[PDB]
Amino acid sequence: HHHMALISMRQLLDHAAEHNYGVPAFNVNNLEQMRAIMLAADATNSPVIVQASAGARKYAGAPFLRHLILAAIEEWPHIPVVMHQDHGTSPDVCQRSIQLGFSSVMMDGSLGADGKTPTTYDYNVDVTRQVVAMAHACGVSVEGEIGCQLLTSVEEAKQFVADTNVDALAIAVGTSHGAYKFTRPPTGDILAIDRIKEIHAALPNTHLVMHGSSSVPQEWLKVINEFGGNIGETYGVPVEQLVEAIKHGVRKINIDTDLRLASTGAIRRFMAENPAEFDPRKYFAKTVDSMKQICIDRYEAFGTAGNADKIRPISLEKMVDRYK
């Protein structure tokens, strides 16, 4: 076989279930971020999810994010790669992602087209169905979201998957985007691992997704603080708890703030340790190194490692036969 095409998310998460592991999802915004992800996936022989933020299209240009993924597939033809559109705010957005060539899209139907306003359950199912139709015609995978309110209930997860049958459901269990996830180390009362168990036990065949799952490594917070940065006491989701969640049906884990912290830490340390250097390539290399280590830490702790060459890709063309 060959990995000159992307694989669907659905295939990759089916593999996660069959072999009891999870896949961390990393955001790509530019060249150095794409290289760190791929170099880590090569080091651990893991399949890859790379996502584009809602604003990644605007920041980088749509041709560039298409062409970064193409370059990655050329340079590491042995790594299966899912290209996933994160946090689509309307069906029309996800359709442009499909036209651009993504193999997986998220229609965040919990929030309105404005991207902030929580929505009626009916609205959620409507735009999520809407996107499901145009994506499954192509073989493209769909992640939807129910819940914003802040805690997902079991019965509505069961009904929402029945009404839309997305390939993956993102659930709310007390995490959020950014570095200020918790004022204290998160305990069972602020990170509801028990609701995951309940939702998994009710839908033992649906792939669950966790947003805002950066651990926020403390040593990087300290490194930033020493070299001119100032980040107050905040905490993320410990890797230990995310490992338990994978044992209970979590297959996709969105991590973004950790890579931002590793990058900002590396530049701050380097720019102070060598104040005469001005070649960006010199500290860009020390962001690839530090981001790559975070991705390696996750691929291994999440069981993603060792699975890249166990996957026989199925084209998005043949994935149409899985839905119709």
Catalytic residue among 14, 86, 194, 289: 86
Residue for token digits 């760190």?
36
H helix or E strand, kind and range, residue 24: strand 23-27
Contact between 316 and its own copies (CB under 8 A)?
A: yes
Q: What are the Cα distances from residue 317, in Å, to 80, 100, 227, 265? A: 16, 16, 50, 43
Contact between 211 and Na ion (CB under 5 A)?
A: yes
Q: Coil, strand, or helix at residue 263?
A: helix
60 binds, among Na ion, its own copies, none (CB under 5 to 8 A by kind): its own copies
Q: What is the DSSP string of 39-94?
A: HHHHHHT--EEEEE-TTHHHHH-HHHHHHHHHHHHHH-TTS-EEEEEEEE-SHHHH
Candidate list 37, 168, 210, 261; residue touching its own copies; CB under 8 A? 261
Q: Is 87 within any annotated ligand binding site?
A: yes
Residue for token digits 């060459």?
309
Whichever of 64 and 121 has its CB closer to its own copies, that residue is 64
Contact between 290 and its own copies (CB under 8 A)?
A: no
Which tokens in the block code for residue 91?
């069906």
DSSP 152: -
Is residue 86 annotated as a catalytic residue, yes or no? yes
Nearest to residue 52, comparing CAs of 83, 6, 79, 74? 83
Candidate list 42, 45, 54, 64; residue touching its own copies; CB under 8 A? 64
Asked if residues 201 and 162 have their Cβ atoms less than 8 Å apart, the reply is no
- From the list 161-169, 241-249, 294-302, 316-324, the region that binds its own copies by CB under 8 A is 316-324
285 alpha-carbon distance from chain centroid? 23
Q: What is the DSSP string of 211-225?
A: SS-----HHHHHHHH
CB of 253 to Na ion, least distance (A): 11
| Binding residues vs Na ion (CB under 5 A) | 211, 254
| Binding residues vs its own copies (CB under 8 A) | 1-5, 29-32, 34-35, 59-64, 66-68, 70-72, 74-75, 77, 91-92, 95-96, 98-99, 101, 133-134, 137-138, 140, 179, 224, 228-231, 260-261, 263-265, 267-268, 271-272, 275-281, 284-285, 287, 313, 316-317, 320, 324
Annotated binding site for Zn(2+): 87, 108, 145, 177, 211
Annotated binding site for dihydroxyacetone phosphate: 178, 212-214, 254-257
- Residues marked active site are found at 86
